[PDB]
Amino acid sequence: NYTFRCLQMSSFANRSWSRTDSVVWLGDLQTHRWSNDSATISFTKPWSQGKLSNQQWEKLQHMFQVYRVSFTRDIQELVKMMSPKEDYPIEIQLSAGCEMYPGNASESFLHVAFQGKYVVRFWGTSWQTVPGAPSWLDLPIKVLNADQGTSATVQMLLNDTCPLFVRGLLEAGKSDLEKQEKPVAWLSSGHRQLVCHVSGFYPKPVWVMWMRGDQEQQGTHRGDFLPNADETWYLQATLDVEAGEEAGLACRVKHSSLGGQDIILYW
Amino acid sequence: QKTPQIQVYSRHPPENGKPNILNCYVTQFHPPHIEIQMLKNGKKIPKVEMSDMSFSKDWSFYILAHTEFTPTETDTYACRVKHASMAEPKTVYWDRDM
Ligand SMILES: *[C@@H]1O[C@H](CO[C@@H]2O[C@@H](C)[C@@H](O)[C@@H](O)[C@@H]2O)[C@@H](O[C@@H]2O[C@H](CO)[C@@H](O[C@@H]3O[C@H](CO[C@H]4O[C@H](CO)[C@@H](O)[C@H](O)[C@@H]4O)[C@@H](O)[C@H](O[C@H]4O[C@H](CO)[C@@H](O)[C@H](O)[C@@H]4O)[C@@H]3O)[C@H](O)[C@H]2NC(C)=O)[C@H](O)[C@H]1NC(C)=O
Ligand SMILES: CCCCCCCC(=O)N[C@@H](CO[C@H]1O[C@H](CO)[C@H](O)[C@H](O)[C@H]1O)[C@H](O)[C@H](O)CCCC(=O)Nc1cccc(CCCCC)c1
Ligand SMILES: CCCCCCCCCCCCCCCC(=O)O
Ligand SMILES: *[C@@H]1O[C@H](CO)[C@@H](O)[C@H](O)[C@H]1NC(C)=O
Ligand SMILES: *[C@@H]1O[C@H](CO)[C@@H](O)[C@H](O)[C@H]1NC(C)=O
């Protein structure tokens, strides 16, 4: 399962200042960036164009270029109309894309948040407010829904463009997507918290456990997965022990990249 | 409005005198405007690289900062974060293990 997410972040500070920036992810790998300051969508992989021809890419990009300008105008105009009831500063976020399933096609999504709260989605053939969204949104969404050409374009992008472009990305980015990077591990710490650090692994799935011989220590607390800057992962696993019980303990790491040869680090 | 969480950890095992990379992962903040510095002995490190800002499923923002560092037992390292959710800057010191 690969989830393609286009993530748009728009900050409207006052009447004269706004910016829209975007990032695009295929799973946990960034494929695109689109800065406010740039007219064009930037590639963050050699394969970020997928299977698309140069002309096909320029057209899709052109459509996003038109959209970014229209969206910025639409929001400023909306705020003017709503004033002073809805006012600056304003944060709008969009999360749109598709989740690719094994063999069988895909589901697509387009979610919109206002001031950090989910408020609007596109679903089926129309935009809709979600239950609990501020009621002042109902009127502008009804208006947006009257725009058939936009609705047709959005339906096309979600249902067709997204899974097709992503199937192209999966092919073109295969060696990157299927890359294997080996973890490196190290230990640190009368009641000690023992810490097993595991860094530099890719892909994300990993198994890290404190052991006494062959016995898994169920007191092992796994931390959050933290990103390294080099598209690899960092994880720690901690075990709370009493003093003079540390002897015979080990941290064991299993990961796809290691080829059945676990890391075992004895305290 | 949500308070940034700060996590400071190294890319490779921290060995004294060996060049390494220190990470500062800042998460769960809103709004996205944020100021992030990394510190050596309380002073700002000049060359700190930043990931693009992005956001999670729950819509909270995250960003990764990182800098080259050589740990020694005479140097402290920290990540300092300024954000509207907080009255003063929040500093998290590298705990020398992470
Ligand atoms: C793109 O795909 C859309 C569906 O996919 C979902 O949404 C997209 C955006 C992605 O997020 C994807 O991942 C999602 O899964 C698709 O939307 C569908 O469009 C058709 C018509 O074009 C809709 O059919 C009409 O349904 C209503 C009833 O709707 C309700 O009931 C059903 C269950 O019974 C639910 O699924 C809905 O949520 C609603 O609660 C009918 O009343 C209506 O019948 C009338 O109209 C037809 C002509 O169209 C006449 O023949 C009849 O006699 C009636 O007069 C339609 O049959 C469908 O609801 C809608 N799906 C959803 C989930 O809303 C969209 O069309 C695709 N677009 C393109 C360009 O490919
Ligand atoms: C990620 C979605 C990208 C899809 C591209 C949308 C197509 C587009 O750029 N349409 C704008 C020009 O429309 C004209 O040209 C079209 C063909 O190029 C058609 O022919 C169309 O008929 C014609 O009108 C259009 O201006 C559109 O409205 C852009 C707005 C995008 C949008 O959501 N706005 C929006 C508006 C209100 C509310 C929300 C979400 C709630 C936010 C909380 C405040 C979002
Ligand atoms: C609306 C989502 C459609 C997905 C179609 C896949 C082709 C998108 C290519 C990624 C570049 C878009 C980056 C801009 C993000 C935005 O402003 O919404
Ligand atoms: C609008 O907001 C920006 C960014 O927050 C700020 O620097 C600027 O002073 C404001 N501009 C005006 C004209 O008030
Ligand atoms: C962002 O880009 C738009 C269009 O190029 C521009 O008008 C606007 O001033 C930019 N905003 C900032 C904050 O740079």
Side-chain angles (χ1 to χ4, degrees), chain A residues 1-84 86-267, chain B residues 1-46 48-98:
Chain A
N1 288 325
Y2 282 99
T3 307
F4 183 73
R5 303 174 164 92
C6 305
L7 307 179
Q8 181 189 308
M9 299 150 267
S10 291
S11 298
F12 296 83
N14 45 66
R15 198 167 35 81
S16 62
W17 198 100
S18 80
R19 64 177 298 122
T20 293
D21 301 284
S22 285
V23 295
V24 180
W25 297 91
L26 182 62
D28 58 2
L29 304 182
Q30 187 179 355
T31 55
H32 307 78
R33 155 183 48 255
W34 195 19
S35 177
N36 193 82
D37 305 323
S38 176
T40 56
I41 300 153
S42 305
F43 294 178
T44 67
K45 296 285 178 289
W47 49 268
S48 299
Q49 212 170 289
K51 253 263 235 281
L52 301 192
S53 83
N54 295 321
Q55 193 195 301
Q56 282 185 112
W57 181 251
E58 306 304 334
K59 272 165 80 208
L60 184 58
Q61 178 175 252
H62 194 264
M63 190 197 309
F64 286 115
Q65 281 166 337
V66 180
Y67 161 81
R68 185 173 72 171
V69 171
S70 306
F71 173 85
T72 301
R73 188 196 61 249
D74 287 2
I75 300 307
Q76 291 163 323
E77 188 39 66
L78 186 60
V79 171
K80 285 193 174 198
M81 187 175 77
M82 292 307 183
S83 190
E86 305 311 315
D87 220 344
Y88 298 111
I90 285 174
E91 184 66 34
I92 298 164
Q93 293 159 268
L94 269 87
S95 174
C98 48
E99 186 166 0
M100 308 304 286
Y101 295 102
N104 285 291
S106 60
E107 286 194 294
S108 297
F109 54 88
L110 196 171
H111 291 195
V112 183
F114 170 75
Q115 313 293 48
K117 315 283 139 195
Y118 178 42
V119 290
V120 166
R121 67 171 182 169
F122 194 90
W123 193 248
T125 56
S126 69
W127 300 90
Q128 46 170 257
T129 58
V130 308
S135 68
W136 67 267
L137 289 163
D138 298 353
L139 171 77
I141 283 305
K142 195 212 280 151
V143 173
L144 187 57
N145 278 333
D147 182 355
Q148 274 178 282
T150 289
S151 180
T153 301
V154 173
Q155 289 174 63
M156 170 198 78
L157 290 165
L158 298 178
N159 298 5
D160 304 311
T161 314
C162 191
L164 182 49
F165 177 66
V166 179
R167 281 188 202 105
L169 284 180
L170 298 173
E171 187 179 83
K174 178 171 163 122
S175 62
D176 267 10
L177 287 154
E178 295 166 15
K179 79 185 204 178
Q180 294 290 326
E181 302 297 332
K182 293 175 189 181
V184 168
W186 71 93
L187 311 184
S188 72
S189 48
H191 196 85
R192 271 196 196 164
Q193 182 156 130
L194 262 45
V195 198
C196 182
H197 305 266
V198 184
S199 186
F201 61 95
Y202 195 89
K204 212 175 171 175
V206 67
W207 184 87
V208 185
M209 199 57 65
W210 280 96
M211 308 292 289
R212 182 175 279 102
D214 296 322
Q215 193 211 11
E216 301 190 46
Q217 309 299 99
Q218 280 157 324
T220 301
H221 315 297
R222 207 181 68 169
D224 290 324
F225 284 88
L226 311 176
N228 287 319
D230 68 343
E231 305 182 309
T232 66
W233 287 102
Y234 178 103
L235 185 61
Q236 66 183 19
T238 62
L239 178 73
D240 288 326
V241 297
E242 267 181 52
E245 212 170 33
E246 294 92 299
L249 284 166
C251 183
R252 188 177 192 92
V253 182
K254 297 177 180 280
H255 186 78
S256 52
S257 68
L258 297 169
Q261 180 160 20
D262 303 0
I263 291 162
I264 346 140
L265 288 182
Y266 298 94
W267 184 266
Chain B
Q1 204 160 75
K2 293 174 194 171
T3 309
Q5 306 314 306
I6 305 150
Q7 288 164 283
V8 183
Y9 50 106
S10 61
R11 169 69 180 72
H12 307 288
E15 283 180 27
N16 296 313
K18 300 274 164 164
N20 203 322
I21 292 163
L22 189 67
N23 300 319
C24 179
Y25 189 44
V26 184
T27 61
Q28 295 172 21
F29 61 95
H30 187 92
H33 183 76
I34 201 158
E35 185 167 13
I36 302 153
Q37 283 169 11
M38 301 184 77
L39 311 175
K40 183 188 183 172
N41 302 309
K43 313 273 185 182
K44 182 195 169 158
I45 302 162
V48 177
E49 284 289 332
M50 219 82 79
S51 71
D52 297 322
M53 205 176 295
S54 185
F55 63 82
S56 291
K57 268 213 192 178
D58 70 354
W59 307 98
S60 69
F61 294 86
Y62 65 86
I63 193 161
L64 181 67
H66 68 105
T67 192
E68 293 167 316
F69 85 133
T70 58
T72 68
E73 306 285 28
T74 61
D75 291 305
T76 69
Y77 297 92
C79 193
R80 182 170 278 153
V81 173
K82 191 177 151 196
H83 188 261
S85 65
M86 303 176 304
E88 302 299 337
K90 183 176 166 191
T91 307
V92 170
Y93 275 84
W94 178 55
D95 204 63
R96 325 188 64 83
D97 294 1
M98 287 270 281

mmCIF file of all heavy atoms in Angstrom, chain A residues 17-19 36-37, ligand 5:
data_model
loop_
_atom_site.group_PDB
_atom_site.id
_atom_site.type_symbol
_atom_site.label_atom_id
_atom_site.label_comp_id
_atom_site.label_asym_id
_atom_site.label_seq_id
_atom_site.Cartn_x
_atom_site.Cartn_y
_atom_site.Cartn_z
ATOM 1 N N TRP A 17 -0.702 40.096 2.665
ATOM 2 C CA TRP A 17 0.303 39.051 2.825
ATOM 3 C C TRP A 17 -0.350 37.680 2.864
ATOM 4 O O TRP A 17 -1.206 37.404 3.713
ATOM 5 C CB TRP A 17 1.081 39.281 4.123
ATOM 6 C CG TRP A 17 2.403 38.570 4.248
ATOM 7 C CD1 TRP A 17 3.638 39.117 4.047
ATOM 8 C CD2 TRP A 17 2.632 37.200 4.639
ATOM 9 N NE1 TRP A 17 4.617 38.182 4.274
ATOM 10 C CE2 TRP A 17 4.033 36.998 4.642
ATOM 11 C CE3 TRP A 17 1.794 36.125 4.981
ATOM 12 C CZ2 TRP A 17 4.620 35.762 4.974
ATOM 13 C CZ3 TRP A 17 2.374 34.895 5.313
ATOM 14 C CH2 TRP A 17 3.777 34.729 5.307
ATOM 15 N N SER A 18 0.060 36.824 1.938
ATOM 16 C CA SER A 18 -0.268 35.412 2.006
ATOM 17 C C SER A 18 0.817 34.605 1.324
ATOM 18 O O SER A 18 1.550 35.127 0.467
ATOM 19 C CB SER A 18 -1.623 35.124 1.363
ATOM 20 O OG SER A 18 -1.517 35.048 -0.040
ATOM 21 N N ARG A 19 0.919 33.336 1.706
ATOM 22 C CA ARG A 19 1.771 32.407 0.977
ATOM 23 C C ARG A 19 1.185 31.010 0.944
ATOM 24 O O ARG A 19 0.527 30.577 1.894
ATOM 25 C CB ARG A 19 3.239 32.433 1.476
ATOM 26 C CG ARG A 19 3.506 31.986 2.914
ATOM 27 C CD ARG A 19 5.006 31.983 3.250
ATOM 28 N NE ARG A 19 5.789 31.053 2.421
ATOM 29 C CZ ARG A 19 6.826 31.363 1.636
ATOM 30 N NH1 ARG A 19 7.290 32.605 1.544
ATOM 31 N NH2 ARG A 19 7.423 30.407 0.935
ATOM 32 N N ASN A 36 6.098 28.893 -2.571
ATOM 33 C CA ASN A 36 5.419 30.118 -2.980
ATOM 34 C C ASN A 36 6.264 30.927 -3.974
ATOM 35 O O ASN A 36 5.745 31.414 -4.979
ATOM 36 C CB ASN A 36 5.066 30.994 -1.773
ATOM 37 C CG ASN A 36 4.088 32.091 -2.136
ATOM 38 O OD1 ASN A 36 2.877 31.862 -2.191
ATOM 39 N ND2 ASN A 36 4.612 33.293 -2.399
ATOM 40 N N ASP A 37 7.561 31.023 -3.690
ATOM 41 C CA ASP A 37 8.495 31.838 -4.472
ATOM 42 C C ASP A 37 8.801 31.281 -5.864
ATOM 43 O O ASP A 37 9.317 32.004 -6.723
ATOM 44 C CB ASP A 37 9.777 32.087 -3.669
ATOM 45 C CG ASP A 37 9.500 32.712 -2.302
ATOM 46 O OD1 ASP A 37 8.575 33.560 -2.189
ATOM 47 O OD2 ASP A 37 10.202 32.344 -1.334
HETATM 48 C C1 LIG C 5 3.787 34.405 -2.796
HETATM 49 O O1 LIG C 5 3.603 34.358 -4.225
HETATM 50 C C2 LIG C 5 2.677 35.304 -4.804
HETATM 51 C C3 LIG C 5 2.571 35.080 -6.314
HETATM 52 O O2 LIG C 5 3.880 34.981 -6.876
HETATM 53 C C4 LIG C 5 3.107 36.737 -4.463
HETATM 54 O O3 LIG C 5 2.209 37.716 -5.004
HETATM 55 C C5 LIG C 5 3.175 36.858 -2.943
HETATM 56 O O4 LIG C 5 3.620 38.167 -2.593
HETATM 57 C C6 LIG C 5 4.123 35.818 -2.332
HETATM 58 N N1 LIG C 5 4.097 35.905 -0.881
HETATM 59 C C7 LIG C 5 5.197 35.974 -0.136
HETATM 60 C C8 LIG C 5 4.950 36.077 1.336
HETATM 61 O O5 LIG C 5 6.335 35.949 -0.588
#
